[PDB]
Amino acid sequence: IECSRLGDGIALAEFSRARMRELTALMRELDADEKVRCVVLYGGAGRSFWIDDITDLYTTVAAISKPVIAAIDGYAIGVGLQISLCCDYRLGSEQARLVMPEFRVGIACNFGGFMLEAAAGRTVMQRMLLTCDEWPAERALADGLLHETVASPRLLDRALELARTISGYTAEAVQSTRPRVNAPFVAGLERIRREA
Amino acid sequence: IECSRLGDGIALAEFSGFSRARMRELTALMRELDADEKVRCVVLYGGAGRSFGDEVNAWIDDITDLYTTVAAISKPVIAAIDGYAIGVGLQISLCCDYRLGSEQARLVMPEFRVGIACNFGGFMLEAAAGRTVMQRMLLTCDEWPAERALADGLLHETVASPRLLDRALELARTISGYTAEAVQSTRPRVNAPFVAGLERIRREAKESH
Amino acid sequence: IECSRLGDGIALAEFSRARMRELTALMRELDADEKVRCVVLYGGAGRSFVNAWIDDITDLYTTVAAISKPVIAAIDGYAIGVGLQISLCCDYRLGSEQARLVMPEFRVGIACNFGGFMLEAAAGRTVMQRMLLTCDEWPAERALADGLLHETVASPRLLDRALELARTISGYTAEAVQSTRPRVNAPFVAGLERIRREAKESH
Fold this sequence. Notes:
3 copies of one chain form a homotrimer.
Chain A: E1 2-7, E2 10-14, H1 18-32, E3 38-42, H2 51-63, E4 68-72, E5 75-77, H3 78-84, E6 89-93, E7 97-99, H4 102-105, H5 110-131, E8 135-136, H6 137-143, E9 148-150, H7 155-167, H8 171-175, H9 178-181, H10 183-195
Parallel strand pairs in A: 2-3, 3-4, 4-6, 5-7, 6-9
Antiparallel strand pairs in A: 1-2, 7-8
Helix pairs in contact in A: 1-2, 2-10, 3-5, 5-10
């Protein structure tokens, strides 16, 4: 996981288990750093995006004071999709596809189910878990699974342009809103750890 | 009332012939179905082109026990709607994991027009379709045709009337095919906040009606 | 400020800390009035809609949402920050094609804890994140598609439509409506009270 400060308060993190814990530590390093004001998680051009390790990562991404942007160019499946659901703004290319196929794979979907209900409501979460169908970018956008869609070439610069706009806001204002607005969400993730 | 095994792990529950004995029987059936390990999916069906589905204090207790059981059982429940789903009828469907509507399906919450309270309706519509749709439904008492109900999240899917039960059983077959432990360790945990919400309404709904 | 009866139990209300207290008091007066069955908050044709500031802002938000009478917000222009937040406490937001919704607290340089909660309760987490982080304007049709507006009408029939609906709401048995509204709104009211404490608790 190669992080790289591009200035203007932006931190671009270009992409398991060790990769989990590395990302959990990098998010805390970025949260403690005064110079950083916005994080961007990029899967790469066309590329894809125990209990305690996964919960620590989900709760970290959602609990840090700084906002996180997930730039999705291809597929975002299960755990990968779940990480993006901990981010404040999911920007997808018109080619992006979202899948939560846990039931078909034969595993429980407690994290996926909770996280999807938060971003898209019970109906969409239920449609996704029970059918295991793929959500194309435009359906994902309409359902609240994506905040915005762009053409694949524009994806990374639109993400950095938004990170810049966010970085240009009074740090205190943003950083005192984000952990408080995400407290109910983080609490819900914590209950899932215990029940499993 | 009448339940039937379709033998893929599918139990089709049908509304025969809303009273308090009807609620208790449905509640007991839901509990019998959660107990039987040969059952992996439940399909609630109104019929062919038919509508879906001190003295007051006992009505509320049976209603609450029905809504809490339908939402708290470990088995997924599919509601198949071929006509009108009004008040209590619509409320039962809002406890199920998947609402499949025919293009003849019409959804209404006319409680206010009828002159009765809508504590449960208000809570359940908010959970399924969001606050705005809930408020539009309660205050206008307008009907929600199938296409509009789908857009707003009141239906998970729409189909043509001749394929309604076919699609219901095809989807029930898909759900039944998943590892039961995977589905059954998810359905009751994911629904716990919704079940807790329904439990708080019990005392509130009593005062209101 | 200016309140008016239109008959059929309809109360049309038209409109700093003192202005917040005046609206809170009016809402309580209308709740106690047996002749009032529906309230219409109107910004007017073509117009817009420290620890003690928190208290008066919470008292207003919780009063608009906790009263037994339904409140319709008629929006003919801009609804920014506090103005947007007031309408988010109302049960029915009716906008004209010239209604524009903005939550630009971050661009202005201030926290958006009330805005964040209220936007999430009304239109979901995603819409909330779009509005807070971009600080963009939501025109009438985009707000309708996102659940920020319940309905859109052409501005010539905006007040007409708000009254048409107020009459429909008023025509219902009052006890059915008035015993439902504070109950359905209690989780929303509880959330606002949590934020009042957490806002004071942080300063």
